[PDB]
Paper text:
SPOUT1, also known as CENP-32 or C9ORF114, contains a putative SpoU-TrmD (SPOUT) RNA methyltransferase (MTase) domain. SPOUT1/CENP-32 localized to mitotic spindles and kinetochores, and its depletion by siRNA resulted in unusual centrosome detachment from the mitotic spindle poles, delayed anaphase onset, and chromosome segregation errors. Structural analysis confirmed that SPOUT1/CENP-32 is a SPOUT MTase with a trefoil knot fold consisting of parallel six stranded β-sheets sandwiched between two layers of α-helices that promote dimerization of the protein. Our SPOUT1/CENP-32 structures also reveal that SPOUT1/CENP-32 dimerizes via a helical segment in the catalytic domain that packs almost perpendicularly against an equivalent segment from its dimeric counterpart.
SPOUT MTases use S-adenosyl-L-methionine (SAM) as the methyl group donor for the methyltransferase reaction. To determine whether SPOUT1/CENP-32 can also bind the cofactor, SAM, and to gain further structural insights into the substrate binding site, we soaked the SPOUT1/CENP-32 crystals in a cryo-protectant solution containing a molar excess of SAM prior to freezing the crystals for X-ray data collection. These crystals diffracted X-rays beyond 2.62 Å. The SAM-bound structure of SPOUT1/CENP-32 was determined using molecular replacement. The difference electron density map calculated for the refined model showed a well-defined electron density for the bound SAM. The mode of SAM binding is similar to that of SAH, with a methyl group pointing out of the deep cofactor binding pocket. The binding of SAH and SAM is similar. E Close-up of the electrostatic surface potential of SPOUT1/CENP-32 71-376 bound to SAM showing the deep pocket formed by the trefoil knot.
Residue numbers in the entry:
A (entry chain A), B (entry chain A): 72 to 118, 138 to 372
Amino acid sequence: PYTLSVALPGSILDNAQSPELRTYLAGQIARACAIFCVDEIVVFDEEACVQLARILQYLECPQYLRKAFFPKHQDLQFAGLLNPLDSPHHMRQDEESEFREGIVVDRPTRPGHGSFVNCGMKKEVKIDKNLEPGLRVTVRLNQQQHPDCKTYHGKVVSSQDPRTKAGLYWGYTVRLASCLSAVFAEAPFQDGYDLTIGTSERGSDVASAQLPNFRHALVVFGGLQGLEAGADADPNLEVAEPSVLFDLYVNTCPGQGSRTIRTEEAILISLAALQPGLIQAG
Amino acid sequence: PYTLSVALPGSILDNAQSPELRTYLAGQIARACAIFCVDEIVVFDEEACVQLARILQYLECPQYLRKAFFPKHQDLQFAGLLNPLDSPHHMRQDEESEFREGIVVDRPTRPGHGSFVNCGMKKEVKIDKNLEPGLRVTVRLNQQQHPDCKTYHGKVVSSQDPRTKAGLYWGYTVRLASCLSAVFAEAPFQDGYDLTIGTSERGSDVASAQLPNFRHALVVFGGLQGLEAGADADPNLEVAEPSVLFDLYVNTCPGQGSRTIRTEEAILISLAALQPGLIQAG
Ligand SMILES: C[S@@+](CC[C@H](N)C(=O)[O-])C[C@H]1O[C@@H](n2cnc3c(N)ncnc32)[C@H](O)[C@@H]1O
Ligand SMILES: C[S@@+](CC[C@H](N)C(=O)[O-])C[C@H]1O[C@@H](n2cnc3c(N)ncnc32)[C@H](O)[C@@H]1O
């Protein structure tokens, strides 16, 4: 199955009128990406990124694991006033699920015995492998999980498994990039992004665009000054206009009735505008 | 040229965590509609509507006219923390424009002479017709506007003119509907909405949908409980499911990775998902 990654600059957070709205905006990004089953979000420095990245990670992390993975931070002061992702890997105890994220507990194992994992279930989940504690893992529960002395049983599996195997969106990862050229180069896939797509009012009409067969797509968004800012700023990138950095450069809202479309708005519009092209090619 | 109207319930404002966010959410709606060149927004009562309607009107009104048309209200306490529409009819003095909205001043006219209008220009604009003051009008400036004794000159024209004639998006109007059946029936066009479109995760796939040639489109959105709530609530509408109220009932985001898409999010997604179908048929 193909991947989709989204890049945008942290600087959009500097545009907010309030601390509260700065947080809400971060949430808007998370949900936009969750909605379109994004696998990866890349926060890049166009000239804050740390705050945006942190918030995105907090929201993606299932709830029963936030306490463990995120100590009190001034950068999640407004956790509260968030929109939740309501994504398949966020459930309550109650819900039976095939798979469930977990943290490798830090309790006494016994010579030979796999670790304990906290999957937010009524009891801890016992597994096969002995593992380094505080590791986030993806556990697939057994079956024949008898009313066993205060332990469920299961096996750890690839975090790719709930997509490839059961068609379940299962969260995104978050990557920090120090510039726009680091967006492309510090990619997590062997052969980079088979397909790159940039966005702008002065790009080509998205209705013309013909998506090439692809394996890993990246869609890039600018902040307030467009992608021009992050192109110029980066020393490793000497272009007249940013169109040439990407396979495609699209305008996703023809005949827009506002002089501007904000980044968080543009992401929803662009990803829908593209969603059918994406599905066809991957 | 075809029209596009959007309907949604005021109740989405009751979902906000803050007074501030209640206002911001209202703004999100305005911009979504501005972006897609919406002509009409219909706020309906699914079981607040007044507050949402007011905010939408405040944002659409050009700035130089807000003071005149909107006294201090507790329902625009957070005007400040808004996103602006940046639409063609919002400019500063500075900008030369062919057309410009105005209010008919309330100054001494002379037997025979047209009114004075305030179009936010350096001088008042003198016109042809004698008109009832406090009327919002659409003025088209002349040419041969000589350095005349502290008055510009121009003619009042249809508010439809800057679209039909110069391809300029020029704002939306706002209508209150007391229920869902009032959305369709209290429509401002002789022959209603030639095409109706409702939205839901349990609608048909938007990629299949084949838009009929049309003159006036309405796209309807539910609040938190979907359109089911406003269907049931209204006494004049006895249906098992809301699909049948509309010509088309679409899911605009196939394979969504969040269990829910909020109304303000769904509007951006749906309107993009449809925008190309719309353009083809009108
Ligand atoms: C506030 S806009 C940037 C405006 C800036 N003045 C410029 O010249 O692009 C923020 C980002 O949203 C996206 N965007 C805005 N309008 C768009 C459009 N019509 N089509 C596609 N993407 C758009 C782009 O990624 C853009 O960099
Ligand atoms: C929070 S959702 C409503 C959820 C509600 N539980 C239901 O059963 O619809 C608010 C509105 O956004 C729109 N919406 C949400 N998901 C959608 C989807 N997948 N496709 C199209 N419109 C959608 C619909 O107008 C919906 O009534």
